[PDB]
Amino acid sequence: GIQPSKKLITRDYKVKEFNKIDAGTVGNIYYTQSTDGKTDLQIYGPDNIVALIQVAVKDNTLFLSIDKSKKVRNFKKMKITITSPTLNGISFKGVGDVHIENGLTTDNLDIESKGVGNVDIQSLTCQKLNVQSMGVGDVKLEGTAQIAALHSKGVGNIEAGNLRANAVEASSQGVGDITCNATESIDAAVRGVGSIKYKGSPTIKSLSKKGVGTIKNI
Amino acid sequence: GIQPSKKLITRDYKVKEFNKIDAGTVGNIYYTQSTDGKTDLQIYGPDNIVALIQVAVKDNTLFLSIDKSKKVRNFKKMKITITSPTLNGISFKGVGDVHIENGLTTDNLDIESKGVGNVDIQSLTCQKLNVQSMGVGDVKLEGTAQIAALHSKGVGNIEAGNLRANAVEASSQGVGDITCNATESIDAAVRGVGSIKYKGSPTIKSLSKKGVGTIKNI
Numbered sequence: 001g002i003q004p005s006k007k008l009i010t011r012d013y014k015v016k017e018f019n020k021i022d023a024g025t026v027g028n029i030y031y032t033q034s035t036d037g038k039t040d041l042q043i044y045g046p047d048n049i050v051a052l053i054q055v056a057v058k059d060n061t062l063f064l065s066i067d068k069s070k071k072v073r074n075f076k077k078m079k080i081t082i083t084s085p086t087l088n089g090i091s092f093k094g095v096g097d098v099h100i101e102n103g104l105t106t107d108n109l110d111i112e113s114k115g116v117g118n119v120d121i122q123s124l125t126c127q128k129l130n131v132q133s134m135g136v137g138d139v140k141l142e143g144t145a146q147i148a149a150l151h152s153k154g155v156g157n158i159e160a161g162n163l164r165a166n167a168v169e170a171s172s173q174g175v176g177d178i179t180c181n182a183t184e185s186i187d188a189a190v191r192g193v194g195s196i197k198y199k200g201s202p203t204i205k206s207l208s209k210k211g212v213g214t215i216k217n218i
Numbered sequence: 219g220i221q222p223s224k225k226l227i228t229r230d231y232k233v234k235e236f237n238k239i240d241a242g243t244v245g246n247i248y249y250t251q252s253t254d255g256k257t258d259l260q261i262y263g264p265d266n267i268v269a270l271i272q273v274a275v276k277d278n279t280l281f282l283s284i285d286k287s288k289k290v291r292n293f294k295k296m297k298i299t300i301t302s303p304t305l306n307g308i309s310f311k312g313v314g315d316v317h318i319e320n321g322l323t324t325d326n327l328d329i330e331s332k333g334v335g336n337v338d339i340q341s342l343t344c345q346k347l348n349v350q351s352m353g354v355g356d357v358k359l360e361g362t363a364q365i366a367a368l369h370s371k372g373v374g375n376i377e378a379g380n381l382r383a384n385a386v387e388a389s390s391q392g393v394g395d396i397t398c399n400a401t402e403s404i405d406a407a408v409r410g411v412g413s414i415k416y417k418g419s420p421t422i423k424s425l426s427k428k429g430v431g432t433i434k435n436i
């Protein structure tokens with residue numbers, strides 16, 4: 001297919017403000033919560049590969065898409081850098097890893113991973129967290145939540161042992177484990193191949209083992 | 219609901235010879251190709267849970283299924299051990315991993331995974347291999363094949379980089395990657411979210427694309 005050019009560029013897209021990301025691209029994504037009220041989108045890589053990404057903001061959502069019929073020899077060097085003052089949702093349906101390396105403070109965060117790649121969120125501070133992992137890859141979470149709903153359905157692990165939550169709702173239906181941390185309550189259901197491990201001494205627990213694996217307090 | 223008993227048993231079923239497995243059970247399966255002409259089926263678990271598994275051999279197929287008329291509270295560890303002189307097919311629609319740890323020599327092998335769990339086949343020697351993955355899980359394959367048809371439609375990877383085949387037919391329509399090894403020819407079609415990676419220097423290649431990912435020689 002398309003031979004990536006030797007001219008490595010950064011394309012800056014002055015997009016409208018958004019609080020949600022919906023991406024069907026190839027390449028790693030790095031999200032930063034802005035501290036100066038700015039919204040920005042930068043795409044780094046070979047100029048003829050960067051040119052394949054279509055960008056639009058609609059209903060407070062940043063949509064990143066590609067012409068799926070386009071053959072590319074390789075997607076090496078592709079880096080998508082996203083920044084906005086707020087973030088409430090990530091819907092990922094491409095190939096690559098999604099990062100929040102330096103924190104996110106939000107009320108509600110909804111993570112929907114339906115692609116090939118990992119999700120790694122560090123220093124998260126939220127009220128409600130909802131994770132639906134449905135693709136191939138791991139979802140790594142660190143920080144705090146009042147409520148954390150962790151639902152794994154694809155192939156991979158939810159690594160949320162360092163995500164301190166008061167109430168946890170965990171269900172494992174694919175292939176992989178859920179590691180979590182519940183200080184007050186835990187509703188855990190094993191329904192696939194894999195186990196649910198939880199830190200803490202929750203007052204209320206509701207456990208259901210209906211697959212291949214176990215529920216263990218660690 | 220049935221409470222699993224504390225009496226863990228192994229039940230031995232002296233079944234008729236079969237060359238196909240069709241299982242809709244909960245629990246890991248371990249298949250062994252016998253070298254002494256024997257056919258055997260053993261099921262390990264709580265005795266009142268083992269008693270829920272329906273076993274029948276019909277037209278050379280071992281059928282394993284759950285009597286779903288009796289609700290079960292919690293599942294405890296289950297293990298299904300299967301042995302026969304030959305194996306030409308595995309159809310899985312339950313919950314659990316399917317293993318062939320110590321090899322299989324066959325003419326044609328047909329793998330149909332519709333459930334939740336992995337398929338891990340080591341030291342495979344066959345003429346024709348057909349894999350149709352439609353559930354949640356990975357299909358891991360090692361050994362040799364003259365022809366390998368690898369069709370992924372669910373969520374998970376086909377890990378066949380150590381399966382040396384002369385001709386490969388690979389298509390990915392779900393979420394996940396196909397890693398394979400084609401020495402003479404490769405027909406590859408990316409139609410979902412994920413990539414097709416192939417080892418070798420095939421003489422003939424046909425590469426088709428309408429998805430999110432790529433086709434790469436590794």
Ligand SMILES: [Cl-]
Nearest residue numbers: 159160161179
């Ligand atoms: Cl963890």
Ligand SMILES: [Cl-]
Nearest residue numbers: 377378379397
């Ligand atoms: Cl592999």
